[PDB]
Design a protein around this ligand. Structure first.
Ligand SMILES: [Fe+3]
Ligand SMILES: [Fe+3]
Lengths: 202, 202
C-alpha cells in the first residue's frame, strides 16, 4: 500500500514564498487524495501493489482498462507532487553545482536564459499542469510542458525538477498572479537536489 | 473588438455562496484576460474581427492554424464565463419553470436525480474544466463534461447552464472542498435564465 511521504520541512518552512496553509492543504488534501485514489484502484488488482509508482506510469497501456485512467492521473499526481516537495528547500543562498550549471549553460545559453524559458513555459500553461526540466536517455536537457498529472516518465525521460502550475499551488497567496508565484518559487528551488538526480543518470 | 460584459449583479451579490473577492478577480482578471487574449489573436485578421465568439468556436478547424488553439481556449473562455455569470442570480426561492422541469424529469428521473448526476460529474472533473447542461437539435438534454474551455458548441449542442470547475472559481472560499462549492452553487443558479435558453430552442 503506497503512503504519503512526509514533507522534508515544516508546513510553514517555505514562507513567504509559499504560504503555510497552502502547503498543508496541498500535501494533506491534494497529494493525500492521489495516494488514496491510487491505493483503491490497485486494491482491485493487488499484483500491481508491488510496482513502483514509476513503473506503473511507464506501463499504463498494460494496466487493466478499468483503472488505467485513475492510475495515470493518480500515480502521475503522487509522483509529480513527490518530486515537487523534494526539489524545494527553505530559502538558501543560491549555489548551482558545476555539473548541472554547465549543462544548463551548454543547452540554454546561460542560467538566466534557462530561467526565462522555464518561467515563460510555466506562465503559458493553459489550465492544470506542470513545467519540467527533464533529460532524455542521452542526458540531453529540455523544458517540458504537461497537462493534468501527465509527466515525462511517459515519454521515456528522466525528470529533474518541476513546478506545479495547478491553481491550487498558488491561488491562496497569489490568486491570478501566477508570474509572481513562479518568480517567488525560484527562491526555494533546491539546486542540490536537482543536481543529485542529474548526477545519478551517470 | 470583443468586450468584457459587466456582471449582471454586484460583486457581493452571490455571498455567501460565492465570495466577493473571487467574483471581482474571476471577472476583472480571469474573464478580462480571455477577452484581451482573444482580441490580440484577432489583431492580424480583420476579416475575423466581425465574427461572434460563437461562430469563432464553431469554425475552429477553418481558422488559420496560427491562432486556432488561442481562439479555442480564449473564445471558449469568454463564452463559458459569459454564460456562467448570466445563469447565476442572487439566491432566491427555487422555482424551476414547467417546461424545463418537465424535460428534466422526463430525461433524468426527477429533479433531485438530475442534481445528483450533475453534481457528481462536477465532482469528478479531473483538472481544469466545466460541466454543462446542454440540448441537442431536438431539445434532448444531457450533462456534458469538458476540459479546458472546451464546450458543447464544439459538438453542435446548445448550452443551457454550466458550472466552472477551474480551481480559481472556488479556491479562496472552499480551497480543496470542491463538493462544498458545487453544493453551494445550486443556491444561486438562475433557473429562469436556463429556461429562457431552453425555450428559445423552440
Ligand atoms: Fe498540486
Ligand atoms: Fe473561471
Amino acid at each position: 500500500k503506497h503512503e504519503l511521504p512526509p514533507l522534508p520541512y515544516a508546513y510553514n518552512a517555505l514562507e513567504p514564498f509559499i504560504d503555510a496553509k497552502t502547503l498543508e492543504i496541498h500535501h494533506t488534501k491534494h497529494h493525500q487524495s492521489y495516494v488514496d485514489k491510487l491505493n483503491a484502484a490497485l486494491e482491485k488488482y493487488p499484483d500491481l501493489q508491488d510496482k513502483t509508482v514509476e513503473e506503473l506510469i511507464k506501463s499504463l497501456n498494460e494496466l487493466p482498462e478499468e483503472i488505467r485512467t485513475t492510475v495515470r492521473n493518480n500515480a502521475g499526481g503522487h509522483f509529480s507532487h513527490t518530486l515537487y516537495w523534494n526539489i524545494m528547500n527553505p530559502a538558501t543562498q543560491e549555489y548551482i553545482p558545476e555539473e548541472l550549471g554547465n549543462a544548463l549553460v551548454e543547452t540554454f545559453g546561460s542560467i538566466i536564459a534557462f530561467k526565462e524559458q522555464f518561467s515563460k513555459a510555466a506562465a503559458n500553461i493553459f489550465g492544470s499542469g506542470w513545467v519540467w526540466l527533464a533529460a532524455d536517455a542521452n542526458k540531453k536537457l529540455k523544458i517540458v510542458s504537461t497537462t493534468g498529472h501527465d509527466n515525462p516518465l511517459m515519454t521515456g525521460d528522466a525528470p529533474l525538477m518541476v513546478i506545479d502550475i495547478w491553481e491550487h499551488a498558488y491561488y491562496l497567496h497569489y490568486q491570478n498572479r501566477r508570474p509572481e508565484y513562479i518568480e517567488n518559487w525560484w527562491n526555494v528551488l533546491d539546486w542540490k537536489a536537482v543536481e543529485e538526480r542529474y548526477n545519478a543518470l551517470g
